[PDB]
Amino acid sequence: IQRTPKIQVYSRHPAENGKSNFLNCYVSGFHPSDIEVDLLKNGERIEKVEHSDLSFSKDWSFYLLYYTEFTPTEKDEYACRVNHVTLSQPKIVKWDRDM
Amino acid sequence: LPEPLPQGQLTAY
Amino acid sequence: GSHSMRYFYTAMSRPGRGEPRFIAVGYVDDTQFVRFDSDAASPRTEPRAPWIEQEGPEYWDRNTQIFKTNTQTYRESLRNLRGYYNQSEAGSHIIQRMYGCDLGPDGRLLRGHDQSAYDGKDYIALNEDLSSWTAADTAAQITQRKWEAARVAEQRRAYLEGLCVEWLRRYLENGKETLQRADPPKTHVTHHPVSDHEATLRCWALGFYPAEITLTWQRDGEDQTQDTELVETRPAGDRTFQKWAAVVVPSGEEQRYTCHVQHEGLPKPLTLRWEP
Known part of the structure; x- marks a missing residue:
């Protein structure tokens, strides 16, 4: 069978409005490995997002870290959009600086 | 260092 | 080690x-x-x-x-x-x-x-x-x-x-x-009211390496495994990892809860509480 991805959206460093940081989207626990991940800024896709090399956990499920530089503000909204064979529609997870 | 190739033919599954 | x-x-x-x-x-x-x-x-x-x-x-x-x-x-x-x-x-x-x-x-x-x-x-x-x-x-x-x-x-x-x-x-x-x-986790507890009679206590562990860590909540000294929301340890991107554990508690009973942290970088397990 297949396994759907777990998704976490968060920053590398504590969020400080106006200060450069890194926005991360960690997808894990999925199988097969093909997966599409986009990082969004106010609904728009961020270009040049980088990701880690494919690896997996002891239960064989895969994990990947997608990341890009970003500067947190009070208004700007960030999120991660994930698509996988196990999803009938892309899953959107908004960034919450408290999560 | 990963597992080196054997002397003979690498055995497939 | x-x-x-x-x-x-x-x-x-x-x-x-x-x-x-x-x-x-x-x-x-x-x-x-x-x-x-x-x-x-x-x-x-x-x-x-x-x-x-x-x-x-x-x-x-x-x-x-x-x-x-x-x-x-x-x-x-x-x-x-x-x-x-x-x-x-x-x-x-x-x-x-x-x-x-x-x-x-x-x-x-x-x-x-x-x-x-x-x-x-x-x-x-x-x-x-x-x-x-x-x-x-x-x-x-x-x-x-x-x-x-x-x-x-x-x-x-x-x-x-x-x-x-x-x-x-x-x-x-x-x-x-x-x-x-081994880089020990930097820890702290945050408080987030959910309603007039409940609030979320979230225990944070940041900047630690290696990834192995034990983060748990106790109420009156008893593990709250079933009522604790524990996210998967995640990579920060600078080699370190992050993790948090949360529990929803009755307003006013926050001091009965203690967060315990275990990590190779720590000589002795840590105990934290919400500090208003």
Whole structure:
């Protein structure tokens, strides 16, 4: 069978409005490995997002870290959009600086 | 260092 | 302390979109140090940690030959397993291999590992004796018999007890400033009211390495395992990890809750409470 991805959206460093940081989207626990991940800024896709090399956990499920530089503000909204064979529609997870 | 190739033919599954 | 080295191979077929892709990544504990991808413009073993860069050309060439040969062999293996399961040539499948050695705090071999899966399910594994196999089904038994006839277990054992341990020790020395350095978690508790009679207490652990950590909530000294929301430990991107545990508590009873943190970087388990 297949396994759907777990998704976490968060920053590398504590969020400080106006200060450069890194926005991360960690997808894990999925199988097969093909997966599409986009990082969004106010609904728009961020270009040049980088990701880690494919690896997996002891239960064989895969994990990947997608990341890009970003500067947190009070208004700007960030999120991660994930698509996988196990999803009938892309899953959107908004960034919450408290999560 | 990963597992080196054997002397003979690498055995497939 | 204790350390381990692991290589993770992923071979994925994709009928109609070229030959199966082979990716290999190597880790020492929770630090990746090498990668190989058959889909790269110019497939070659590449460094992913500063301390491995000092290895000479011979090392990289050796690695690349191994991965290039494995790339081809896994394509045969994917064809073989498709047949073992009477599957059609139309579907995409994946073979994964995870292997390596574990060392104790004294640098001695604790045990070796060599496991494989097909489409995410355990297929065949080398037993702890590094001499016999455990096959998951009648298909894996074909591989088992083929590997027993070719004395494959002996090759795996020779590696796991030899080069695996020797090179892991070398890496641990060359990267001792990081690989043998445990960074304790920076901890704190946040408070988030949910309603007039409930509030969320979230215990944070940030900037720690390695990833192994124990984060739990206690109410009056009793573990709240069932009522605790525990997110998976996640990478920060700077080698460290993050994690949090949360519990929803009755307003005014916050002081009855204590967060406990256990981490190699900590000489003694920590106990925290919400500090208004």
